[PDB]
Coordinates of C-alpha atoms and ligand atoms in Angstrom, one line a residue:
Chain K
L1 CA 270.1 207.6 244.7
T2 CA 266.7 207.7 246.5
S3 CA 265.9 209.1 250.0
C4 CA 263.7 206.9 252.1
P5 CA 262.7 206.7 255.8
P6 CA 264.5 204.2 258.0
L7 CA 263.5 200.5 257.5
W8 CA 262.4 201.3 253.9
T9 CA 264.5 201.0 250.8
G10 CA 264.5 202.9 247.6
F11 CA 264.5 202.2 243.9
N12 CA 264.0 204.9 241.3
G13 CA 262.3 207.5 243.4
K14 CA 259.9 205.2 245.2
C15 CA 260.2 203.8 248.5
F16 CA 259.4 200.1 249.4
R17 CA 259.1 198.0 252.4
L18 CA 258.2 194.2 252.5
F19 CA 255.8 193.3 255.4
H20 CA 256.1 189.9 257.0
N21 CA 252.7 189.4 258.5
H22 CA 250.2 187.5 256.2
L23 CA 247.0 189.6 255.4
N24 CA 244.5 189.2 252.7
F25 CA 244.4 191.6 249.7
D26 CA 242.1 194.2 251.2
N27 CA 243.8 194.5 254.5
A28 CA 247.2 194.3 252.9
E29 CA 246.2 197.5 250.8
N30 CA 244.8 198.9 254.0
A31 CA 247.9 198.2 256.0
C32 CA 249.9 200.3 253.4
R33 CA 247.4 203.1 253.5
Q34 CA 248.4 203.7 257.2
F35 CA 251.5 205.4 255.8
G36 CA 251.1 208.8 254.2
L37 CA 252.6 212.1 253.0
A38 CA 251.5 215.2 254.8
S39 CA 252.4 218.9 254.4
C40 CA 254.4 220.4 257.2
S41 CA 251.4 222.8 257.7
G42 CA 249.7 219.5 258.9
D43 CA 247.2 218.4 256.0
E44 CA 247.1 214.7 254.7
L45 CA 248.1 214.9 251.1
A46 CA 248.3 211.3 250.0
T47 CA 248.5 207.7 251.1
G48 CA 250.8 204.7 250.7
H49 CA 249.6 201.6 248.7
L50 CA 250.6 198.2 247.6
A51 CA 253.6 198.5 245.3
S52 CA 252.8 199.1 241.7
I53 CA 255.4 198.1 239.1
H54 CA 256.3 199.8 235.9
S55 CA 259.3 198.2 234.3
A56 CA 261.6 195.2 233.7
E57 CA 264.0 197.1 236.2
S58 CA 261.4 197.9 238.9
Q59 CA 260.3 194.3 238.6
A60 CA 263.8 192.8 238.9
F61 CA 264.3 194.9 242.0
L62 CA 261.2 194.0 243.9
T63 CA 262.0 190.3 242.9
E64 CA 265.4 190.8 244.6
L65 CA 263.8 192.5 247.6
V66 CA 261.8 189.4 248.1
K67 CA 264.3 186.7 247.2
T68 CA 266.9 188.2 249.5
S69 CA 264.6 189.1 252.3
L70 CA 263.1 185.6 252.5
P71 CA 265.8 183.2 251.2
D72 CA 264.5 180.4 253.3
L73 CA 261.0 180.6 251.8
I74 CA 262.1 180.2 248.2
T75 CA 260.7 176.9 247.0
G76 CA 261.1 175.1 243.6
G77 CA 257.5 176.1 242.9
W78 CA 255.6 179.3 243.1
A79 CA 256.1 180.1 246.8
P80 CA 256.6 182.5 248.2
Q81 CA 253.9 184.7 247.0
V82 CA 254.0 188.4 248.0
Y83 CA 251.1 190.7 247.2
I84 CA 251.5 193.7 244.9
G85 CA 248.8 196.2 244.1
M86 CA 247.5 194.6 241.0
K87 CA 243.6 194.1 240.6
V88 CA 242.0 192.0 237.9
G89 CA 238.3 192.8 237.2
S90 CA 235.7 191.1 234.9
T91 CA 237.5 190.8 231.5
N92 CA 241.3 189.7 232.2
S93 CA 242.1 192.8 230.5
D94 CA 240.7 195.1 233.4
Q95 CA 244.0 195.5 235.2
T96 CA 244.3 198.5 237.6
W97 CA 246.9 199.2 240.2
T98 CA 245.6 200.4 243.7
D99 CA 247.7 203.6 243.8
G100 CA 245.9 204.5 240.4
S101 CA 249.1 204.4 238.3
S102 CA 248.7 202.9 234.9
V103 CA 249.3 199.4 233.9
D104 CA 252.2 200.1 231.5
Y105 CA 254.3 197.0 232.5
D106 CA 253.1 193.3 232.0
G107 CA 255.0 191.0 234.4
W108 CA 252.6 188.1 234.5
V109 CA 253.9 184.6 234.2
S110 CA 252.9 182.8 231.1
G111 CA 249.3 181.7 231.6
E112 CA 248.4 184.5 234.2
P113 CA 246.0 186.0 235.1
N114 CA 243.5 183.0 235.0
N115 CA 241.5 183.0 238.3
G116 CA 239.4 186.1 237.5
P117 CA 237.0 187.8 237.9
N118 CA 238.4 189.9 240.8
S119 CA 241.7 188.1 241.4
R120 CA 244.7 189.9 242.6
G121 CA 248.5 189.8 241.6
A122 CA 251.5 188.7 243.6
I123 CA 255.2 188.2 243.0
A124 CA 255.7 184.6 243.0
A125 CA 259.3 184.2 244.1
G126 CA 259.7 180.4 243.6
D127 CA 262.1 179.0 241.1
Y128 CA 259.2 178.3 238.8
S129 CA 257.6 181.6 238.5
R130 CA 261.0 183.3 239.2
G131 CA 259.5 186.4 240.5
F132 CA 256.8 187.1 237.8
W133 CA 253.2 187.6 238.8
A134 CA 250.4 185.2 239.6
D135 CA 246.8 186.0 240.1
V136 CA 245.2 184.5 243.3
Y137 CA 242.0 185.1 245.1
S138 CA 241.3 188.0 247.1
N139 CA 241.0 186.2 250.5
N140 CA 244.4 184.4 250.2
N141 CA 246.6 185.5 253.1
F142 CA 250.2 186.5 252.1
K143 CA 253.2 188.8 252.8
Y144 CA 252.9 192.2 251.0
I145 CA 254.9 195.0 249.6
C146 CA 254.0 198.6 250.3
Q147 CA 255.2 201.7 248.6
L148 CA 255.2 205.1 250.2
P149 CA 253.3 207.8 248.3
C150 CA 255.0 208.6 244.9
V151 CA 255.7 212.2 244.4
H152 CA 257.8 214.7 242.3
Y153 CA 258.3 218.4 242.0
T154 CA 256.7 220.1 239.1
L155 CA 258.9 223.1 238.0
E156 CA 257.1 223.2 234.8
Chain S
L15 CA 266.1 211.6 255.6
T16 CA 269.0 209.6 254.5
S17 CA 270.0 208.6 251.0
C18 CA 270.9 204.9 250.4
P19 CA 271.4 202.6 247.5
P20 CA 268.5 200.0 246.6
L21 CA 268.2 197.2 249.0
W22 CA 269.9 199.2 251.8
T23 CA 268.2 201.3 254.5
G24 CA 269.2 204.4 256.2
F25 CA 269.3 205.8 259.7
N26 CA 271.1 209.2 260.5
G27 CA 273.2 209.3 257.5
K28 CA 274.6 205.8 257.5
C29 CA 273.3 203.0 255.3
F30 CA 272.7 199.4 256.6
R31 CA 271.9 196.1 255.2
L32 CA 271.1 192.8 257.0
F33 CA 272.8 189.8 255.3
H34 CA 271.2 186.4 255.7
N35 CA 273.9 184.0 255.0
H36 CA 275.8 182.8 258.2
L37 CA 279.5 183.8 258.2
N38 CA 282.1 183.7 260.8
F39 CA 283.1 187.2 262.2
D40 CA 286.2 187.5 260.0
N41 CA 284.5 186.6 256.7
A42 CA 281.4 188.7 257.8
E43 CA 283.8 191.8 258.0
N44 CA 285.2 190.8 254.8
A45 CA 281.9 190.4 253.1
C46 CA 281.1 193.9 254.1
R47 CA 284.4 195.3 252.8
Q48 CA 283.4 194.2 249.2
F49 CA 281.2 197.3 249.3
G50 CA 283.1 200.7 249.0
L51 CA 283.1 204.4 248.2
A52 CA 285.2 205.6 245.2
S53 CA 285.7 209.0 243.6
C54 CA 284.2 209.7 240.3
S55 CA 287.7 209.8 238.9
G56 CA 288.0 206.1 239.7
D57 CA 290.2 205.7 243.1
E58 CA 288.8 203.5 245.9
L59 CA 288.5 205.9 248.9
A60 CA 287.0 203.7 251.7
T61 CA 285.4 200.4 252.5
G62 CA 282.1 199.1 254.2
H63 CA 282.3 197.4 257.5
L64 CA 280.3 195.5 260.0
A65 CA 277.9 198.0 261.4
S66 CA 279.2 200.1 264.5
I67 CA 276.8 201.6 266.9
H68 CA 276.9 204.9 268.6
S69 CA 273.8 205.8 270.5
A70 CA 270.6 204.4 272.1
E71 CA 268.7 205.6 269.0
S72 CA 271.2 203.9 266.5
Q73 CA 270.9 200.7 268.6
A74 CA 267.1 200.8 268.8
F75 CA 266.9 201.1 265.0
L76 CA 269.3 198.1 264.3
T77 CA 267.3 196.2 266.9
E78 CA 264.1 196.8 264.8
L79 CA 265.9 196.1 261.6
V80 CA 266.7 192.6 263.0
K81 CA 263.4 192.0 264.9
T82 CA 261.1 193.0 261.7
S83 CA 263.6 191.4 259.1
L84 CA 263.6 188.0 261.0
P85 CA 260.3 187.8 263.0
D86 CA 260.2 184.0 262.8
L87 CA 263.6 183.5 264.3
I88 CA 262.9 185.7 267.4
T89 CA 263.1 183.2 270.4
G90 CA 262.3 184.0 274.1
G91 CA 266.1 183.6 274.7
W92 CA 269.1 185.5 273.1
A93 CA 268.6 184.0 269.5
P94 CA 268.8 185.3 266.8
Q95 CA 272.3 186.7 267.2
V96 CA 273.5 189.0 264.4
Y97 CA 277.1 190.1 264.2
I98 CA 278.0 193.8 264.4
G99 CA 281.6 195.1 264.2
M100 CA 282.5 194.9 267.8
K101 CA 285.9 193.2 268.9
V102 CA 286.9 192.5 272.4
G103 CA 290.7 192.1 272.9
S104 CA 292.8 191.0 276.0
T105 CA 291.2 193.0 279.0
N106 CA 287.3 193.2 278.4
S107 CA 287.9 197.0 278.2
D108 CA 289.8 196.7 274.9
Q109 CA 286.7 197.3 272.7
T110 CA 287.2 198.5 269.1
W111 CA 284.9 198.8 266.2
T112 CA 286.0 197.5 262.8
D113 CA 285.3 200.7 261.0
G114 CA 287.7 202.4 263.4
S115 CA 284.9 204.6 265.0
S116 CA 285.1 205.1 268.7
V117 CA 283.3 203.0 271.3
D118 CA 281.3 205.8 272.8
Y119 CA 278.2 203.7 273.2
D120 CA 277.7 200.8 275.6
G121 CA 275.0 198.5 274.4
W122 CA 275.9 195.3 276.1
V123 CA 273.6 193.0 277.9
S124 CA 274.0 192.9 281.7
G125 CA 277.0 190.6 282.1
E126 CA 278.5 190.9 278.7
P127 CA 281.2 190.7 277.4
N128 CA 282.5 187.7 279.2
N129 CA 284.0 185.2 276.6
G130 CA 287.1 187.2 276.1
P131 CA 290.0 187.5 275.0
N132 CA 289.1 188.0 271.3
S133 CA 285.4 187.5 271.4
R134 CA 283.1 189.6 269.1
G135 CA 279.8 191.4 269.7
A136 CA 276.3 190.5 268.2
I137 CA 272.9 192.0 268.6
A138 CA 271.0 189.3 270.4
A139 CA 267.4 189.9 269.3
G140 CA 265.8 187.2 271.7
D141 CA 263.2 188.6 273.9
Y142 CA 265.5 188.1 276.9
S143 CA 268.5 190.2 275.6
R144 CA 266.0 192.5 273.9
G145 CA 268.4 193.5 271.1
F146 CA 271.4 194.4 273.4
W147 CA 274.9 192.8 272.7
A148 CA 276.5 189.6 273.5
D149 CA 280.0 188.5 272.9
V150 CA 280.5 185.1 271.2
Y151 CA 283.4 183.4 269.7
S152 CA 285.0 184.6 266.5
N153 CA 284.4 181.2 264.7
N154 CA 280.6 181.1 265.5
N155 CA 278.6 181.5 262.2
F156 CA 275.8 184.1 262.1
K157 CA 273.9 186.6 260.2
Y158 CA 275.5 190.1 260.0
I159 CA 274.8 193.7 259.4
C160 CA 276.9 196.0 257.2
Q161 CA 277.1 199.6 257.0
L162 CA 278.4 201.4 253.8
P163 CA 281.3 203.8 254.2
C164 CA 280.5 206.6 256.5
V165 CA 281.4 210.0 255.2
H166 CA 280.3 213.7 255.6
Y167 CA 281.3 216.9 253.8
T168 CA 283.8 219.1 255.7
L169 CA 282.9 222.8 255.0
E170 CA 285.0 223.9 257.8
Chain I
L29 CA 267.5 214.4 242.9
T30 CA 270.9 215.2 244.4
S31 CA 271.7 215.8 248.2
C32 CA 273.8 218.8 248.9
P33 CA 274.8 220.8 252.1
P34 CA 273.0 224.0 252.8
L35 CA 274.0 227.0 250.5
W36 CA 275.2 224.5 247.9
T37 CA 273.1 223.2 244.9
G38 CA 273.1 219.9 243.1
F39 CA 273.1 218.7 239.5
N40 CA 273.6 215.1 238.7
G41 CA 275.2 213.8 241.8
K42 CA 277.7 216.7 242.1
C43 CA 277.3 219.7 244.4
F44 CA 278.2 223.2 243.4
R45 CA 278.5 226.7 245.0
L46 CA 279.3 230.0 243.2
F47 CA 281.7 232.1 245.2
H48 CA 281.5 235.8 245.0
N49 CA 284.9 237.2 246.0
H50 CA 287.4 237.5 243.1
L51 CA 290.5 235.4 243.4
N52 CA 293.1 234.4 240.9
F53 CA 293.1 230.9 239.6
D54 CA 295.4 229.3 242.1
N55 CA 293.8 230.8 245.2
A56 CA 290.4 230.0 243.7
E57 CA 291.4 226.2 243.5
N58 CA 292.8 226.5 246.8
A59 CA 289.5 228.2 248.3
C60 CA 287.7 225.1 247.1
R61 CA 290.1 222.8 248.6
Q62 CA 289.1 224.0 252.0
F63 CA 285.9 221.9 251.6
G64 CA 286.3 218.1 251.8
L65 CA 284.9 214.7 252.5
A66 CA 286.0 212.8 255.6
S67 CA 285.1 209.4 257.0
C68 CA 282.9 209.6 260.2
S69 CA 286.0 207.7 261.8
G70 CA 287.8 211.1 261.4
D71 CA 290.2 210.6 258.3
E72 CA 290.3 213.3 255.4
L73 CA 289.3 211.2 252.2
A74 CA 289.2 214.0 249.5
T75 CA 289.1 217.6 248.7
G76 CA 286.8 220.1 246.7
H77 CA 288.0 221.7 243.6
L78 CA 287.0 224.2 241.0
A79 CA 284.0 222.8 239.2
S80 CA 284.8 220.3 236.3
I81 CA 282.3 219.9 233.4
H82 CA 281.4 216.9 231.5
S83 CA 278.5 217.5 229.2
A84 CA 276.2 219.7 227.3
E85 CA 273.8 219.4 230.3
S86 CA 276.2 220.0 233.2
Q87 CA 277.5 223.0 231.2
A88 CA 273.9 224.4 230.6
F89 CA 273.3 224.1 234.3
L90 CA 276.4 225.9 235.3
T91 CA 275.7 228.6 232.8
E92 CA 272.2 229.0 234.5
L93 CA 273.7 229.0 237.9
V94 CA 275.9 232.0 236.9
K95 CA 273.4 233.7 234.7
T96 CA 270.6 233.7 237.5
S97 CA 273.0 234.1 240.4
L98 CA 274.5 237.4 238.9
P99 CA 271.7 238.8 236.5
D100 CA 273.1 242.3 236.9
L101 CA 276.5 241.4 235.8
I102 CA 275.6 239.9 232.5
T103 CA 277.0 242.3 229.8
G104 CA 276.6 242.1 226.1
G105 CA 280.3 240.9 225.9
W106 CA 282.2 238.2 227.6
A107 CA 281.6 239.4 231.1
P108 CA 281.0 238.0 233.7
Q109 CA 283.8 235.5 233.7
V110 CA 283.7 232.8 236.4
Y111 CA 286.6 230.4 236.9
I112 CA 286.1 226.6 236.4
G113 CA 288.9 224.1 237.1
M114 CA 290.2 223.9 233.4
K115 CA 294.0 224.2 233.0
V116 CA 295.6 224.6 229.5
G117 CA 299.5 223.7 229.4
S118 CA 302.0 223.9 226.6
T119 CA 300.2 222.7 223.4
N120 CA 296.6 223.9 223.4
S121 CA 295.5 220.2 223.5
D122 CA 297.1 219.8 227.1
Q123 CA 293.8 220.4 228.9
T124 CA 293.3 218.9 232.4
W125 CA 290.7 219.5 235.1
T126 CA 292.0 220.2 238.7
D127 CA 289.9 217.4 240.2
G128 CA 291.8 215.0 237.9
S129 CA 288.6 214.0 236.0
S130 CA 289.0 213.7 232.4
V131 CA 288.5 216.3 229.6
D132 CA 285.6 214.4 227.9
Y133 CA 283.6 217.6 227.2
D134 CA 284.5 220.5 225.0
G135 CA 282.8 223.8 225.9
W136 CA 285.2 226.3 224.5
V137 CA 283.7 229.3 222.6
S138 CA 284.9 229.3 219.1
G139 CA 288.6 230.5 218.9
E140 CA 289.3 229.4 222.5
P141 CA 291.9 228.5 224.0
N142 CA 294.3 231.0 222.6
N143 CA 296.2 232.6 225.5
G144 CA 298.4 229.6 226.1
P145 CA 300.7 228.3 227.5
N146 CA 299.2 228.0 231.1
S147 CA 295.9 229.8 230.7
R148 CA 292.8 228.7 232.7
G149 CA 289.1 228.3 231.6
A150 CA 286.3 230.4 232.8
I151 CA 282.5 230.4 232.0
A152 CA 281.9 233.7 230.2
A153 CA 278.4 234.5 230.8
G154 CA 278.1 237.5 228.7
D155 CA 275.7 237.5 225.7
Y156 CA 278.5 236.9 223.3
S157 CA 280.2 234.0 224.8
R158 CA 276.6 232.8 226.0
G159 CA 278.3 230.8 228.9
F160 CA 281.0 228.9 226.9
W161 CA 284.6 228.9 228.1
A162 CA 287.3 231.4 227.5
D163 CA 290.9 231.0 228.6
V164 CA 292.5 233.8 230.5
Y165 CA 295.6 234.3 232.4
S166 CA 296.3 232.7 235.6
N167 CA 296.6 235.9 237.6
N168 CA 293.3 237.4 236.4
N169 CA 291.0 237.9 239.5
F170 CA 287.4 236.4 239.1
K171 CA 284.5 234.8 240.8
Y172 CA 284.7 231.1 240.7
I173 CA 282.7 227.8 241.0
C174 CA 283.4 225.0 243.4
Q175 CA 282.3 221.4 243.5
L176 CA 282.4 219.3 246.6
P177 CA 284.2 216.0 246.1
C178 CA 282.7 213.7 243.7
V179 CA 282.0 210.1 245.1
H180 CA 279.8 207.2 244.4
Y181 CA 279.3 203.8 246.0
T182 CA 280.9 200.8 244.4
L183 CA 278.7 197.8 244.8
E184 CA 280.4 196.0 242.0
Chain T
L1 CA 271.5 216.3 254.4
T2 CA 268.4 217.5 252.4
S3 CA 267.6 216.6 248.7
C4 CA 266.7 219.6 246.5
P5 CA 266.1 220.1 242.7
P6 CA 269.0 221.9 240.8
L7 CA 269.3 225.6 241.6
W8 CA 267.6 225.2 244.9
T9 CA 269.4 224.7 248.3
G10 CA 268.2 222.9 251.2
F11 CA 268.2 223.4 255.0
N12 CA 266.4 220.9 257.4
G13 CA 264.2 219.2 254.8
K14 CA 262.8 222.3 253.1
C15 CA 264.1 223.7 249.8
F16 CA 264.8 227.4 249.1
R17 CA 265.5 229.6 246.2
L18 CA 266.3 233.3 246.3
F19 CA 264.7 235.1 243.2
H20 CA 266.4 238.3 241.9
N21 CA 263.7 240.1 240.0
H22 CA 261.8 242.6 242.3
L23 CA 258.1 241.9 242.6
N24 CA 255.5 243.1 245.1
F25 CA 254.3 240.8 247.8
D26 CA 251.3 239.4 245.9
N27 CA 253.1 238.6 242.8
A28 CA 255.9 237.2 244.8
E29 CA 253.8 234.7 246.6
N30 CA 252.3 234.0 243.2
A31 CA 255.7 233.4 241.5
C32 CA 256.5 231.0 244.2
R33 CA 253.1 229.1 243.7
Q34 CA 254.2 228.2 240.1
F35 CA 256.4 225.5 241.7
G36 CA 254.5 222.5 243.0
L37 CA 254.6 218.9 244.1
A38 CA 252.5 216.4 242.2
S39 CA 251.9 212.7 242.5
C40 CA 253.5 210.5 239.9
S41 CA 249.9 209.5 238.7
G42 CA 249.7 213.1 237.6
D43 CA 247.6 215.1 240.4
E44 CA 248.8 218.5 241.7
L45 CA 249.1 217.9 245.6
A46 CA 250.6 221.2 246.8
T47 CA 252.2 224.5 245.9
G48 CA 255.4 226.5 246.7
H49 CA 255.2 229.7 248.8
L50 CA 257.1 232.5 250.1
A51 CA 259.5 231.0 252.6
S52 CA 258.2 230.7 256.3
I53 CA 260.6 230.5 259.1
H54 CA 260.5 228.5 262.3
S55 CA 263.6 228.8 264.3
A56 CA 266.8 230.8 265.2
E57 CA 268.6 228.2 262.9
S58 CA 266.4 228.5 259.9
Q59 CA 266.4 232.3 260.3
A60 CA 270.3 232.2 260.5
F61 CA 270.4 230.2 257.4
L62 CA 268.2 232.3 255.3
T63 CA 270.1 235.4 256.5
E64 CA 273.3 233.7 255.2
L65 CA 271.5 232.8 251.9
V66 CA 270.8 236.4 251.3
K67 CA 274.1 237.9 252.7
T68 CA 276.2 235.6 250.5
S69 CA 273.9 235.7 247.4
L70 CA 274.0 239.6 247.4
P71 CA 277.1 240.7 249.0
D72 CA 277.2 243.9 247.0
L73 CA 273.9 245.2 248.1
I74 CA 274.5 244.8 251.8
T75 CA 274.3 248.4 253.1
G76 CA 275.1 249.6 256.7
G77 CA 271.3 250.0 257.3
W78 CA 268.3 247.7 256.5
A79 CA 268.8 247.2 252.8
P80 CA 268.6 244.8 251.2
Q81 CA 265.1 243.8 252.1
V82 CA 264.0 240.3 250.7
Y83 CA 260.3 239.2 251.1
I84 CA 259.4 236.2 253.2
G85 CA 255.8 234.9 253.4
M86 CA 255.0 236.9 256.6
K87 CA 251.6 238.7 256.6
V88 CA 250.5 241.2 259.2
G89 CA 246.7 241.9 259.5
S90 CA 244.5 244.4 261.7
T91 CA 246.1 244.0 265.3
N92 CA 249.9 243.5 264.9
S93 CA 249.5 240.2 266.6
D94 CA 247.6 238.7 263.5
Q95 CA 250.6 237.3 261.9
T96 CA 250.2 234.4 259.4
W97 CA 252.6 232.6 257.1
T98 CA 251.4 232.2 253.4
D99 CA 252.1 228.3 253.5
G100 CA 249.6 228.2 256.4
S101 CA 252.3 227.0 258.8
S102 CA 252.3 228.5 262.2
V103 CA 254.0 231.6 263.6
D104 CA 256.1 229.8 266.2
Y105 CA 259.2 231.9 265.7
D106 CA 259.5 235.6 266.2
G107 CA 262.3 237.1 264.2
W108 CA 261.3 240.7 263.9
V109 CA 263.7 243.5 264.5
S110 CA 263.2 245.6 267.6
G111 CA 260.2 247.7 266.9
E112 CA 258.8 245.7 264.0
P113 CA 256.0 245.3 262.8
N114 CA 254.8 248.8 262.9
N115 CA 253.4 249.6 259.3
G116 CA 250.2 247.6 259.9
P117 CA 247.4 246.8 259.1
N118 CA 248.3 244.6 256.1
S119 CA 252.0 245.1 256.0
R120 CA 254.4 242.1 255.0
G121 CA 257.7 240.9 256.4
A122 CA 261.1 240.9 254.8
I123 CA 264.5 239.8 255.8
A124 CA 266.4 243.0 256.2
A125 CA 270.0 242.0 255.5
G126 CA 271.6 245.4 256.2
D127 CA 274.2 245.5 259.0
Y128 CA 271.8 247.3 261.2
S129 CA 268.8 245.0 261.1
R130 CA 271.3 242.1 260.8
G131 CA 268.8 239.8 258.9
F132 CA 265.9 240.1 261.3
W133 CA 262.5 241.1 259.9
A134 CA 261.0 244.3 259.0
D135 CA 257.5 244.9 257.8
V136 CA 257.0 247.0 254.8
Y137 CA 254.0 247.8 252.5
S138 CA 252.5 245.2 250.3
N139 CA 253.1 247.2 247.1
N140 CA 256.9 247.7 247.7
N141 CA 258.9 245.7 245.1
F142 CA 261.7 243.5 246.4
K143 CA 263.6 240.2 245.8
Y144 CA 262.0 237.2 247.4
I145 CA 262.7 233.7 248.8
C146 CA 260.5 230.7 247.7
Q147 CA 260.3 227.4 249.5
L148 CA 259.3 224.3 247.7
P149 CA 256.2 222.5 249.1
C150 CA 257.0 221.1 252.6
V151 CA 256.1 217.5 253.0
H152 CA 257.1 214.5 255.3
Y153 CA 256.2 210.7 255.3
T154 CA 253.7 209.8 258.0
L155 CA 254.6 206.3 259.3
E156 CA 252.5 206.8 262.3
Ligands
CA20 CA1 246.6 182.0 239.1
CA21 CA1 279.0 186.0 276.1
CA22 CA1 291.1 233.8 225.5
CA23 CA1 258.4 248.6 259.3

C-alpha cells in the first residue's frame, strides 16, 4: 500500500494524477514539473513528470485510471487519448521516458509507433486500442497523466 | 500523508473514491459496502460507506475531488450533485451519517435541508452551491463518493 | 513500505514493538491486548497480540529486531529469550498462535518444542539458538514482542 | 501515520533509528550518512543525518524513544547521553543542525550549552536532565539517533 498526497492515487510506490485540461506534449510535461520533492531543509531535489510505465501491471492500472475516470469519453475507436511521458526520436527504436527511467516495457498497440520522427506516446483508451499506446504528434492537445517524483530509501 | 489502495485517494487518514455510475441513495450506500476491512486471519471487521464529512477541510477536499474529477459537468447552478452519506429523518434535526460517525460538521447550503422527512445529502458542486450540501430525494439517481472503513490504532 | 504508529516498527504490513519489562506468558499476551484497532465511529474492532511469525523473512526480521535492540544481552547460549505468541498444547503438534493466525511456519530450534504440555515459544537470540524458537514454561518471566492488529482491505 | 523502513520508527513524517554502538560525533554523523534517498532512475538525492529536532512534541518523542529503548541505562543523573545532530560553534549562539534544518526549537537543559566552542548536543535521558540537551565534547563516544532524509512533495 502506497502513500500519496490528496487527489493523487498510488500504484507500486509511485503516485499518479490524471489532468483534465488538454495540453500539447511539451506543456503537459511542463505542467507535471510544477510538482516536486524537496528536502525539509528547503532544497528542491526532483521534479514530477509525465507518467512512465514499466510493466503489464503498471499499464493495466493506468488503463483503469483512464477508463474509470472518463467513462463517458470511451469510444469504440482510439479515443480518449491521454499523454504519457514517451518520446520517439529519429529511428523508431529511440524511445526515451521524460523522467529518464528506462524503456523496459513495450505497450504499443500493434503497428505503433509510426508517426516518427519526434512523436509522443499516449494511452488510447478506446475499445480498439484497449489502453495500449499510440504515437501522435507533439502539438496534439490531450489530457495527460503525471507522476510525482519516484524515490526510494537506499539502506545498502 | 495517507495510505490508500490504488485508484483511491486519501485525506487525513480516510480513503475516498468518486464513483461515476448513477445510483439511488440506497444502492449507492450498498455499492460502498462491497468494500471492507478484514483481519489477516480472514474475519470481516468493517464495511465501507458513503463518505461522511467532519470539517471545513474535509468538505473543501471532497469539493475539489468532485470539481476536478468532473470539470465538464460543473454548471452555474447546483449540478452536479454527488451523494454523500447524509440521512435526514422526521424533524430536519435528525441527521445521521451512514458510517455511524457523528454529525459534528454542518456543510449545508443556506436553506438546506428542506425536502424532509427522509431526504439525503449530496455535495452540489455547481458554482451556486459551491460544494455545500443539498438534500434531495432518496430515489434520485446520482454519482456517489465512498470512503473505505475508517480505523485507527488504540495505544491507549 | 509499512505504516506504523510512533515507537513501533513495521515489516510486511504488520507493526511490531519489543517490550522491555519481563512478564510471564499470560500477562505478556495481555499487555499486548491493551493495544487495539477501533473504527473512527468509536467501536473496538480488534486487539493486539504477541507477535506471530509466518516465514523465514518475518523470522529473520524479528531476530534482527531483538539482536539490535538488545545487543548487550546476546550471550553465547540461548539468552536472551523473548516471548512470541506460540502456544504448545497436549501433543507437541498442537501449535496455535494467540492472534488465531495459522502455524504455517516452523522456526523451532532443532529439538524444540520439548517442555510440553502447555509450553510457550520464544525467540532465543543467543549465539546458540541464533534466533530460532525455544519452548519454555508458561510462568517464566521474559521480554516480549507485540504486534498491532493485522488488517487488510478487501476489494474483492 | 508515517511510513518508515523496517527497524525504523516514525514521528510526524520523519523516520528515526537509535543506534547502540558508541561513536564520536563525527563518525556518528557519518554512520547516519550511509542511509540515503535515491531516485528510482538510480541517482543519490540526499543523505541521512543525526536527528534534528523542531518542537516540544518531536523532543518528547525522541526522549521516549531513548527512555524506552534503554530503560536499564537511565540513571538519576544525566546519563544516558545520546547524540543528536546539534553543533555549537564559537559564540554559544552559533547553533546549527547537521541536516541543515534551522534551529527553531530550544531544548537545552538549564545552563546548556557551556562547553563551547565546538561542542555537540545530546539528549540526556537521566532523570535529572529529563531528556533535554547537554553539550559535550566532540570526541566523547555515545549512542546516537539517525533520521532518514527528510522530504515532502511540493504541489505548489
Ligand atoms: Ca500513430
Ligand atoms: Ca433540497
Ligand atoms: Ca525447551
Ligand atoms: Ca555541557
